[PDB]
A paper describes a structure:
Sequence analysis revealed that Ser501-Arg573 is not conserved among the MRP family, forming a short helix flanked by two loops. This suggested a potential regulatory role of Ser501-Arg573; thus, we termed the fragment of Ser501-Arg573 as the regulatory (R) motif. To determine whether the peptide-derived EM density is from the R motif, we generated [name]-ΔR by removing the R motif and determined its structure by the single particle reconstruction. [name]-ΔR displayed a relatively low ATPase activity and adopted a similar conformation to wt-[name], with a peptide still trapped in the binding pocket. These results suggested that the R motif does not affect the organization of the TMDs and NBDs, and is not the source of the peptide EM density in the [name] cavity.
Residue numbers in the entry:
A (entry chain B): 48 to 61
B (entry chain A): 94 to 501, 575 to 680, 685 to 786, 840 to 1357, 1362 to 1427
The structure:
């Protein structure tokens, strides 16, 4: 999801 | 992995904030460009797996003793385990939100109020800008601290839970209760799930408070009218969750669609040659095309929804602003610029928070599912051990009147056994009698019901499956014991491992994959012999082993080596018990006959009855080719124009707000009492309705432009992808067979299977997100520059620094990910190896070494992953600091020119500058993902471009004749044919002629050229010399379809395609139904077809594995006979069913020319002529009757 990848792209794995 | 102390323990608060340790590491990486396992730090003692395991097991035991093993909740256990860290994280996050709310709103309000004032007081505005910089920096640092604490806590929790779960599975009773795949998955991704849980939940506890604070601030600023602006998120976010659910549903559809498509692709490529000489390409081409169009429709729907749900945040804030301000202005309320821009900035704040929260909610749900699964895998039965010592050490095994029932069933009843040391005891019985049950019960996997079992000394076990350790030959033979030379050599020579040593050049030092069954059995026996335990149990060691070598091994090992220790013999062969010291017969779980062998035949029991039974980076070329496949530069220009129009229209709405506020009274003379004067009030302008109408038009433009852009982009991307698919299919179906002869089908299948779905479901997504992010950032910067160019010349060097940071971070991230994968792979390999043979490990009591090895693997696997996560956080901190510098400089620039610009312009500038925050690491990550996807598409492009082209299906030679072939006469003349270049020639000067209506049989040794004639006659591989004449017409002067349509063969193996009987017989439907029925009755198939209500619509699966073999052969030969080709060849078509097939073939094609490629002499007996091939040449040519009558004839040699 667009919102799901928002938090992951901050500092987590994709 | 060589260090004294981790930098964490020796790092201060400032270093913890700026990650100076990883800064030095990244500088070293940039200096070198490559990383190694030695350059990284080892795990500190704080996060060691063993200590965390001890803490977790202690807490779990306490909870179990507290509530009991009936309502135990691991949620409470992990809560106590991480409580202190969680409270620290939530306090720090509360500080983050308080700062990021109090700073921007209050500073912006005060700055705009001062700007609206007339007098100049620099002493106040400088204080304000210093304050706002302080709040921004404090919020950034507090967020960094929160994330660092969350990372450490997550690492600790993941390590502890993984090692405890491994201990639990190593202490398991049965392995067949649950699937092996899920048991591997419970130790593969659950650590990532726990990491997500901890970190992103601690982040989840930060959204509602700032949302509520924003609502309160908005209402207190505006009035009772702030509810309209605060209700937009409530009315909207259900739409986002609805869109997410719909996208998930459509994805669930297209995954099944593409599964069907890839199954069809595998089916068609499995028999590519079989299609190749039939010229049936168009049928499967069209089938693939329609499946592709169905999946393309599903992808279109999914893409519409995805592009709908991409970039709502500026849209959400714009909608909130327009609705709130239209309502406020229409109802006669007054307003100023400062309130407006404070409102929009606060709105940006809650948009940030509410964009953070939802994936955290999803991660929490996944965590709940995972911990429930763990609780399920925490409450099974534990394998017990029987430690009751016997009365005397002489009686190593003792057991008295014990009965058992297999857990899932009473099997064994009233058993009385006693075996002394040094005595060899054999076990006799049938399958299912209880041999396996009794040895398993002795192994300790069975409970104790009656009496007691006495077990003393170690145990030696050899497996029926012969479990092989995932290591080299020299490793698993020692099995944790010290190395010896003479003992190892004697053991190896005892089990005849010398052929195994000689066959493999590096046999002594070759890793064994997770070989032959005999080799596994013999290495198992060698391992057992080297183990040198106390009690040696043994089951069927010569079942898969050859009789002679097995007997030699038994004589040289059991009768020589283990003559002084207790040995238990179990085997399905009763011929080895003649020399055994004692024989035990096992029957129906109860002992019936026992004693010495001679007495065992003397008693003439049921043993004698069965005893006699056996006696009788990527360049711009990839980007250019992808753009060209998209439809040329015009589509690129259109999509860029659409994105620019969307962002420019958002700019238009905001600038219209600014213009509305700036217009003021418009020089309107109004009365305010007893006197009249010009009052700069919004409500006095007689044209506010026009402005409201322009607002409505702006909102409509918002919605329409977003929808149009999304639809157009999705359609363009899918058109490009489908064009690439069609091109690749067209090229691959016109490819040589040498492609498949040289390259395995796995690579091509993977290119069709995973790369295609990867590009289709990933590249548009990341590409669109990256384009939107970059265009939004560029447009905001362009606005701020259009207000102040000095800002632009200030941010230039900042752009350069951002590029440098991006390069460094990309290098470090790639290196860290490579190290993580390279340390992850052997981890999974070891888990698989351990779970494969758990019973043997339990039998040998080697559990501690395995858990120690797994702890080592977990440590050196989780070190680089933790470093990688910290590096990403460090990059985020640096980019946030750059944005803070930007906000400080734009605030100072706004201050410096007080009184010369209208307040609305300053407010819009500061609002956009605030919006600029937190929009850089997103760009970097999206760039990395896009370049990875373009690397994949580059691989696909190289794969498609490196192909070749065959001869065209149509040639200038034209059709030979409408009635071609006129006869069945073929003459060969010096056939020279070779499989490949530089390959030895398979055909060497062979010339022969075949008269029509004759049966010809080709018999020869393997590789003599029997198979080559099929390709030679079909022009499949170009002739290297000589000519082939059929009816006086050279084969090379006929088009591919022209002669491929008049030739048919029958392969060795039946070939049945997925689909229906009608499709599997004639997809083109060029035959009438009565002809099909006549063919079926000739083949004797109507009796097996008519009774089915789907007689001509009977579904056929992959390879048609639902009929009998006779039915398959009959339908295949029907698929040969309906074509009524003049020339037909069989290739080794292979009791009553076989005879029926042969007689059907004999009666079927009696009126054509038969060529037979048969390896069986008996079937070809009585043929008209026999073809003999001597390594690619013919030596005899006559009737077989005169050939079998000649002893010197080669044809008569193998007959005897």
């Amino acid at each position: 999801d667009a919102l799901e990848t928002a938090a992951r792209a901050e500092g987590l794995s994709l | 992995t060589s260090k004294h102390q981790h930098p964490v323990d020796n790092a201060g608060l400032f270093s913890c904030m700026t990650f100076s340790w990883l800064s030095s590491l990244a500088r070293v990486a940039h200096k070198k460009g490559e990383l190694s396992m030695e350059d990284v730090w080892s795990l500190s003692k704080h996060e060691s797996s063993d200590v965390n395991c001890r803490r977790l097991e202690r807490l779990w035991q306490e909870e179990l003793n507290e509530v009991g093993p009936d309502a135990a909740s691991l949620r409470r256990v992990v809560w106590i385990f991480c409580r202190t860290r969680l409270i620290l994280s939530i306090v720090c996050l509360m500080i983050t939100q308080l700062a990021g709310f109090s700073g921007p709103a209050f500073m912006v309000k005060h700055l705009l109020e001062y700007t609206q004032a007339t007098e100049s007081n620099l002493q106040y505005s400088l204080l304000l800008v210093l304050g706002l910089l302080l709040t921004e920096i404090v919020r950034s640092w507090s967020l960094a601290l929160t994330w660092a604490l969350n990372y450490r806590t997550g690492v600790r929790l993941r390590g502890a839970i993984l090692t405890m779960a491994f201990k639990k599975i190593l202490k398991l009773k049965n392995i067949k209760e649950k699937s092996l795949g899920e048991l591997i998955n419970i130790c593969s991704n659950d650590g990532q799930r726990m990491f997500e849980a901890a970190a992103v939940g601690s982040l989840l506890a930060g959204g509602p408070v700032v949302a509520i604070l924003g609502m309160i601030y908005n209402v207190i600023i505006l009035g009772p009218t702030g509810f309209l602006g605060s209700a937009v998120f409530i009315l909207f976010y259900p739409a986002m969750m609805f869109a997410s659910r719909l996208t998930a549903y459509f994805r669930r559809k297209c995954v099944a669609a593409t599964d069907e498509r890839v199954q069809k692709m595998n089916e068609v490529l499995t028999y590519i040659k079989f299609i190749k000489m039939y010229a049936w390409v168009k049928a499967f081409s069209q089938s693939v095309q329609k499946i592709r169009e169905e999946e393309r429709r599903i992808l279109e729907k999914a893409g519409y929804f995805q592009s709908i749900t991409v970039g709502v945040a500026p849209i959400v804030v714009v909608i909130a602003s327009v609705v709130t301000f239209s309502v406020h202005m229409t109802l006669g309320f007054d307003l100023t610029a400062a309130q407006a821009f404070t409102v929009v900035t606060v709105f940006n704040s809650m948009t940030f928070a509410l964009k953070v929260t939802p994936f955290s909610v999803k991660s929490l749900s996944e965590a709940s599912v995972a911990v429930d699964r763990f609780k399920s895998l925490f409450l099974m039965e534990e394998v017990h051990m029987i430690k009751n010592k016997p009365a005397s050490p002489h009686i190593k095994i003792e057991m008295k009147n014990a009965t058992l029932a297999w857990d899932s069933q009473r099997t064994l009843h009233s058993i009385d056994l006693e075996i002394q040391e040094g005595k060899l005891v054999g076990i006799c019985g049938s399958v299912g009698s209880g041999k396996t049950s009794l040895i398993s019960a002795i192994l300790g996997q069975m409970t104790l019901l009656e009496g007691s079992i006495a077990i003393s000394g170690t145990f030696a076990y050899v497996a029926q499956q012969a479990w092989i350790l995932n290591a080299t030959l020299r490793d698993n033979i020692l099995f944790g014991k010290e190395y010896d030379e003479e003992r190892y050599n004697s053991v190896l020579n005892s089990c005849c491992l010398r052929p195994d040593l000689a066959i493999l050049p590096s046999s002594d030092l070759t890793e064994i994959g997770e070989l032959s069954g005999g080799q596994r059995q013999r290495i198992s026996l060698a391992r057992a012999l080297y183990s040198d335990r106390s009690i040696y149990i043994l089951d069927d060691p010569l079942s898969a082993l050859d009789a002679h070598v097995g007997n030699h091994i038994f004589n040289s090992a059991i009768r020589k080596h283990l003559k002084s220790k207790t040995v238990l013999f179990v085997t399905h062969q009763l011929q080895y018990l003649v020399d055994c010291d004692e024989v035990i017969f096992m029957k129906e779980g109860c002992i019936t006959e026992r004693g010495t062998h001679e007495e065992l035949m003397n008693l003439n029991g049921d043993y004698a009855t069965i005893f006699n039974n056996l006696l009788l980076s990527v360049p711009w070329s990839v980007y250019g080719v992808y753009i060209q496949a998209a439809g040329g530069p015009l589509a690129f220009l259109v999509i860029m124009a659409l994105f620019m129009l969307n962002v420019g229209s958002t700019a238009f709405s905001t600038w219209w707000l600014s213009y509305w506020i700036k217009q003021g009274s418009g020089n309107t003379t109004v009365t305010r009492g007893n006197e009249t004067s010009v009052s700069d009030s919004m409500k006095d302008n007689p044209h506010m309705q026009y402005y409201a109408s322009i607002y409505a038009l702006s909102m409509a433009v918002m919605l329409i432009l977003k929808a149009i852009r999304g639809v157009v982009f999705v359609k363009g991307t899918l058109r490009a992808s489908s064009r690439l698919h069609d091109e690749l299919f067209r090229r691959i179906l016109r490819s040589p067979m040498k492609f498949f002869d040289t390259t395995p089908t796995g690579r091509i299948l993977n290119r069709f299977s995973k790369d295609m779905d990867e590009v289709d479901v990933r590249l548009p997504f990341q590409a669109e997100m990256f384009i939107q992010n970059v265009i939004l950032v560029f447009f905001c910067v362009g606005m701020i520059a259009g207000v102040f160019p000095w800002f632009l010349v200030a941010v230039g060097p900042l752009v350069i620094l951002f590029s440098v940071l991006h390069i460094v971070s990309r290098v470090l991230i790639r290196e860290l990910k490579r190290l993580d994968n390279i340390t992850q792979s052997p981890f999974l390999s070891h888990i698989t190896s351990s779970i494969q043979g758990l019973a043997t490990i339990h039998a040998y009591n080697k559990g501690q070494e395995f858990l120690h090895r797994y702890q080592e693997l977990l440590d050196d696997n989780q070190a680089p992953f933790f470093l990688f996560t910290c590096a990403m956080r460090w990059l985020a901190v640096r980019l946030d600091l750059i944005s803070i510098a930007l906000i400080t400089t734009t605030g100072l620039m706004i201050v410096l020119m007080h009184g010369q610009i209208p307040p609305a312009y300053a407010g819009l500038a500061i609002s956009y500058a605030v919006q600029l925050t937190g929009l850089f690491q997103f760009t970097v990550r999206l760039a990395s993902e896009t370049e990875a996807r373009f690397t994949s598409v580059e691989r696909i492009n190289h794969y498609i471009k490196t192909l070749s082209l065959e001869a065209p299906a149509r040639i200038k030679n034209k059709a030979p004749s409408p009635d071609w072939p006129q006869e069945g006469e073929v003459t060969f003349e010096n056939a020279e044919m070779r499989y490949r270049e530089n390959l030895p020639l398979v055909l060497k000067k062979v010339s022969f002629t075949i008269k029509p209506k004759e049966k010809i049989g080709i018999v020869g040794r393997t590789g003599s050229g029997k198979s080559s004639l099929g390709m030679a006659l079909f022009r499949l591989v170009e002739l290297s010399g000589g000519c082939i004449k059929i009816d006086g017409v050279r084969i090379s002067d006929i088009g591919l379809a022209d002669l491929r349509s008049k030739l048919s063969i029958i392969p060795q193996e039946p070939v049945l395609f997925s689909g229906t009987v009608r499709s599997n017989l004639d997809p083109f439907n060029q035959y009438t139904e009565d002809q099909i029925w006549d063919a079926l009755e000739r083949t004797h198939m109507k009796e097996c077809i008519a009774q089915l209500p789907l007689k001509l619509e009977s579904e056929v699966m992959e390879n048609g594995d639902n009929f009998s073999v006779g039915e398959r052969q009959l339908l295949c030969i029907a698929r040969a006979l309906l074509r009524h080709c003049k020339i037909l060849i069989l290739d080794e078509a292979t009791t009553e069913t076989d005879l029926l097939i042969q007689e059907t073939i004999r009666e079927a094609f009696a009126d054509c020319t038969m060529l037979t490629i048969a390896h069986r002499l008996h079937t070809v007996l009585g043929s008209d002529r026999i073809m003999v091939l001597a390594q690619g040449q013919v030596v005899e040519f006559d009737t077989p009757s005169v050939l079998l009558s000649n002893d010197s004839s080669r044809f008569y040699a193998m007959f005897a």
